[PDB]
Structure formats: C-alpha cells, structure tokens
Amino acid sequence: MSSLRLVSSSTIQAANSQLIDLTVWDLIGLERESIQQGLLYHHPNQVDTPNQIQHLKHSLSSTLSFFPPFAGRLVITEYEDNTATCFIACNNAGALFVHAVAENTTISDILQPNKYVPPIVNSLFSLNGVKNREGTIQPLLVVQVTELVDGIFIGLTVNHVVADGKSFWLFVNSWAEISRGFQKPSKLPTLERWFLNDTDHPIRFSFSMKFQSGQLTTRFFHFTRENIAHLKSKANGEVTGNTERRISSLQALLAHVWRSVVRCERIDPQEVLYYILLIDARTRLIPPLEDDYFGNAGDAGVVIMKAGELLEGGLGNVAWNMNKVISLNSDEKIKNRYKSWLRTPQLPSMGMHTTFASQLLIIANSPRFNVYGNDFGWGKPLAVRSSAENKRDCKIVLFAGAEEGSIDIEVCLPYEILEALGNDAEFLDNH
Ligand SMILES: CC(C)(O)[C@H]1CC[C@](C)([C@H]2[C@H](O)C[C@@]3(C)[C@@H]4C[C@H](O[C@@H]5O[C@H](CO)[C@@H](O)[C@H](O)[C@H]5O)[C@H]5C(C)(C)[C@@H](O[C@@H]6OC[C@@H](O)[C@H](O)[C@H]6O)CC[C@@]56C[C@@]46CC[C@]23C)O1
C-alpha cells in the first residue's frame, strides 16, 4: 500500500540590510495564492538519493545568493486609517526545504494516463492554501522534493507578491544551472521594481472590502505543433481584410479552446463571456523594463464576447479580438492605469458572481517559459504539474510541451465539461 510522509524540513539561507519596494502589480497579489508548480523526473538507473537531496539543498542555497528576495520576508505595516504598506526585506531568514517520501508511489501513479490530475499531486507541494500576505512570517519560497519508486518530484511554492510566472521560471532555470555546475546563472535578475515616480513608494493601499466553487476538477490536454500550426493558418485564413497573417499561434489556440469550452457547456447564445489574459508590461513600457526584471509586471486584458458570436463568428474572429485586446495594452494605458490605481489603491475583489463555467475563464502562465531545460544533473524532466489547489476559478494554465513547439494546457472546470472536451473530436487535442 502506498503512503506519503515528511522526512525533514530545513531552513535554507542564501550562501552569500537591503529592502525592495513593491509596486502595484506586486501588491495586487497580497490576498491571493502562491504559484505552485513542480517538475517530475524519472530515474532509469539507480541513484544515490541522500546525495541527490543534499546536492539540491546546497545548490538551492547557492542560487539564493543571486535571488535574495526568495530568502527574505515581507514587511507589512497596517495603519489606523485602514491603509497599509508592504515591502520585501532581504534579511536572509531563509527559504524552506521539505524532504518527503511517497512509499510505493510511481511516476505513472502521478501521470494518470490521459486522465484527471490525481489527488496525490496536491500533496507534492507544501504550504497549500497560504495567502501571499502571510509572507511576513512564512518563507517566500518553499521547495518540496518527494521521493518516488522510480524518480522524484521537485515542487516549489513561490509567493506571488515576490514573483510572477516569468520570474518563477527564471529562478528554476537558474537553480538547475547552478546544480549542473554553473558558477553563476546565465541570466541575472533585475531586482529594482518599477514606479512611474521615485516619490510613489511606499504605496499606501487598502486590503479587502463562483459557479461550482469547491467542485471543479483538473485535466491536462496536449496540443501538438502541427495542430497548433493548423489553427493559426485557419484563423488567419478567415480574416484575410487587413492581415499579414498576424494572428499568432497562441492567440489561435486560445481562441479555439474558448470556443470549445463554450460549445461543450451548451449555453444561451446571449450570454456574455469574459476571457482574462495577462499581458506582460516588460516589453510594452517605454522605455521597456529589463527582460529579466524580477517581480510582477502584467495586467489583465479582458476579452468580452457574446456566446452566439463566439461560436457562430468563426475561429479567426475570436482570435482577431484577442489580438486587438493585446494591442490596446500600450505604454499609455499601462501608465494611466498605474496612475489611476495610485489614487484608488484598493486591492481587487475577485469579481462577479458567476452562474456557469464558461462565464469567466482565467488564462495563466505561458508556453514561453522553459520547462524541459531544467536539468539538475540527472536528466531533463518528464512532465510539469501544478498543485491543483484551485477548485474555485475556471482556469486554463499554459505549459510548454515536451516536444518542440507543442503546448500542454491544464484545465480546471466542472467534471462534465472536461468529459465533453475529451470526447469532442473538434477539440483537436492528442493523447
Ligand atoms: C472589463 C470589465 C467590464 O471592466 C470587467 C468585468 C469584470 C472583469 C471580468 C474583470 C475586472 O474588470 C478586473 C478583473 C480582471 C479582476 C481583477 C484582477 O485584475 C487586475 O485588476 C486591477 C484592478 O483591480 C488592475 O489594475 C490590474 O491591471 C488587473 O490585472 C484579476 C487578477 C489579476 C487577480 C487575475 O489574476 C491573474 O490571472 C492571470 C494569471 O496569469 C496570474 O497569475 C494572476 O495573478 C485573476 C482575475 C482578476 C480578479 C479579476 C477577475 C476579472 C475582473 C473582475 O472585467
């Protein structure tokens, strides 16, 4: 019979004071969840496991020297007028390293064949459910390494006020390099964060103030490079007037997934639908931020369409609308939205009351993040998984696929819609 237990929990400080001021993008995450993603590895041959665990521990400490925020803590000051400030103290209080053993549990137990994410996956991460503002006391980075019969799982819990998805995977890429023998990471973070004026920080903000919540389930779908290329051509072929074939591969796929989810739920064609993209500000500010700007730097772009138009209007029209919402996130709108936020600095509510699954769909992560380059010395990973802690939001999480140019999507929806999707030949997934 299989089981799961914790062997040890250890504080990891940076191998070798300063403060970081947080900007609007960072503060918005204070009352939300951590990023919880991890990497699954197969051990074809025998491995000296105590030596592997020790090597991950020491290479983690070496990497933290280059990313001191992950070894620090948040500092929150609450004021009588119900406002607050927040910053990161790089005080080297340390990350947390959790060593767990899943007896009689295997790779294939974790990757159930073309099925749903099994419950064991959520236990491969530590500090599940902890909101980011609890980083005043809790580590900003927790690493759980779980031993399996035929491999290991490396699961990270990262405070979303400190880092977005891009920065999460910058750190993982850099940790893998250090573990492989690199002296320094190949990409060094930019740690000073963005404000329109030096006088803005510390920003003084206020805290506080869903269909089938708690009942959602999670399933992965795989999209080959070919099927993606097929959808891009189709979408661009349907919008000829004014096109140099500028609908991207990702836009076409996301448009296709949106249509497929709505098709499978079978809803009134008068329903209004909201599709939440996160648009990176790094490349869009003038002057742009550094590519390796370490923090949050992205804004919701909300695509809105009637269900009837979404389906009856064709793939290219949906993808064209997405392309246009992305294009409106200009340097002007980023800066004006920032300025407008400073004058009503309220952390957001997570939005409307939803009465069906397709109503509000959140798109997270990106296929541009490097998942399969994370060789720590024992080979590339077999798969990427998240904690699947979320059972509240209808959500699509994007991952680079194992094959060149493919994409894995992790879909969190009611079970019956995920079943319809897996039986829909128009949904052009594979495996
Ligand atoms: C266009 C309309 C008609 O007005 C309206 C109708 C209403 C709505 C559908 C819009 C609101 O209008 C604003 C809206 C987007 C909310 C406020 C947030 O958006 C931020 O709102 C603040 C202001 O409060 C802006 O300044 C930021 O630019 C913006 O980003 C976001 C995030 C950032 C927390 C978001 O989380 C990221 O999901 C992507 C992942 O990749 C990341 O991991 C992850 O963090 C989850 C969704 C969520 C909660 C909601 C939900 C949907 C809302 C409620 O559109």
Domain with residue 87: its CATH number is: 3.30.559.10
Kindly state whether residue 205 falls inside one of the protein's structural domains: no
Identity at 400, one-letter amino acid code: A
**Which residues are registered as beta bridge partners of 274?**
304, 360
CA dist 156 → 169, 334, 339, 414 (Å):
10, 30, 34, 26
Active-site residue, 160 included: yes
Buried b (16+ CB within 10 A) or exposed e, 390-424: bebbbbbbbbbbeeeebbbbbbbbbeebbebbbee
Q: Which residues contact 327 (CB under 8 A, 6 or more apart)?
A: none
362 CB less than 6 Å from ligand 1?
A: yes
* Greatest distance between any 2 Cα atoms in the chain: 62
Task: Compute φ and ψ for 73, nearest 5 degrees.
Answer: -140, 160
Number of domains in the chain: 2
- Tokens at 138, concatenated: 């809790």
- Tokens at 67, concatenated: 């990313």
Kindly state whether residue 278 falls inside one of the protein's structural domains: yes
DSSP secondary structure code for residue 288 in this structure: P
Looking up tokens 């779908």, which residue turns up? Answer: 221
* Ligand 1 atom closest to residue 360's alpha carbon, by position in its atom list: 9
Residues 134 and 226 in one domain: no
- Tokens at 28, concatenated: 């918005």
d(CA 246, CA 309): 21
* Helical pair 249-265 and 225-238, crossing angle rounded to 10 deg: 90
DSSP secondary structure code for residue 113 in this structure: T
276 CB less than 6 Å from ligand 1?
A: yes
* Helical pair 315-327 and 249-265, crossing angle rounded to 10 deg: 120
Final residue in a domain of this structure, among 180, 206, 235: 180
Nearest one of 147, 104, 93, 148 to 2, comparing CA atoms: 104
- Whether the CB-CB separation of 377 and 55 falls below 8 Å is answered with yes
Q: Which residues contact 64 (CB under 8 A, 6 or more apart)?
A: 12, 13, 14, 15, 70, 71, 95, 141
Using only C-alpha atoms, the chain has a radius of gyration, in whole angstroms, of: 22
Kindly state whether residue 189 falls inside one of the protein's structural domains: no
Active-site residue, 43 included: no
Nearest one of 367, 251, 267 to 316, comparing CA atoms: 251
* SS3 at position 129: coil
Say if strands 272-280 and 360-365 run parallel, antiparallel, or are unpaired.
parallel
d(CA 85, CA 77): 5
- Whether the CB-CB separation of 132 and 31 falls below 8 Å is answered with yes
Q: How many CA atoms lie within 13 A of 81 on its CB side?
A: 4
The angle at the Cα of 183, spanning 179 to 184, to the nearest 5 degrees, equals 95
Q: Is the peptide bond before 189 cis (omega within 30 degrees of 0)?
A: no
Residues 168 and 225 in one domain: no
Count Cβ atoms below 10 Å from residue 18 Cβ, excluding itself: 11
Kindly state whether residue 123 falls inside one of the protein's structural domains: yes
What's the gap between Cα 88 and its chain centre? 21
Q: Which domain holds residue 163?
A: 3-180
* Ligand 1 atom closest to residue 300's alpha carbon, by position in its atom list: 30
Looking up tokens 């919402």, which residue turns up? Answer: 325
Catalytic residue chosen out of the listed positions 200, 292, 375, 424: 375
Residues 147 and 268 in one domain: no
What's the gap between Cα 431 and its chain centre? 23
Residues 111 and 7 in one domain: yes
Nearest one of 185, 153, 159, 245 to 60, comparing CA atoms: 185
Count Cβ atoms below 10 Å from residue 350 Cβ, excluding itself: 11
- Whether the CB-CB separation of 295 and 26 falls below 8 Å is answered with yes
- Whether the CB-CB separation of 262 and 358 falls below 8 Å is answered with yes
Residues 151 and 246 in one domain: no
- H-type helices in 20-164, by residue range? 24-27, 49-64, 107-110
CA dist 312 → 232, 269, 295, 317, 423 (Å):
18, 9, 40, 10, 21
Residues 154 and 230 in one domain: no
Identity at 174, one-letter amino acid code: S
Final residue in a domain of this structure, among 153, 180, 207: 180
Identity at 84, one-letter amino acid code: A
| Torsion angle of C-alpha atoms 300, 126, 107, 53, degrees rounded to 10 | 120
d(CA 14, CA 63): 7
333 CB less than 6 Å from ligand 1?
A: no
345 CB less than 6 Å from ligand 1?
A: no
Looking up tokens 């380059």, which residue turns up? Answer: 373
Task: Compute φ and ψ for 87, nearest 5 degrees.
Answer: -145, 175
Kindly state whether residue 207 falls inside one of the protein's structural domains: no
Catalytic residue chosen out of the listed positions 21, 160, 280, 393: 160
| Torsion angle of C-alpha atoms 292, 297, 303, 304, degrees rounded to 10 | 170
* Ligand 1 atom closest to residue 304's alpha carbon, by position in its atom list: 1
d(CA 201, CA 203): 5
Residues 250 and 313 in one domain: yes
Looking up tokens 């948040």, which residue turns up? Answer: 74
Q: Is the peptide bond before 185 cis (omega within 30 degrees of 0)?
A: no
* SS3 at position 339: helix
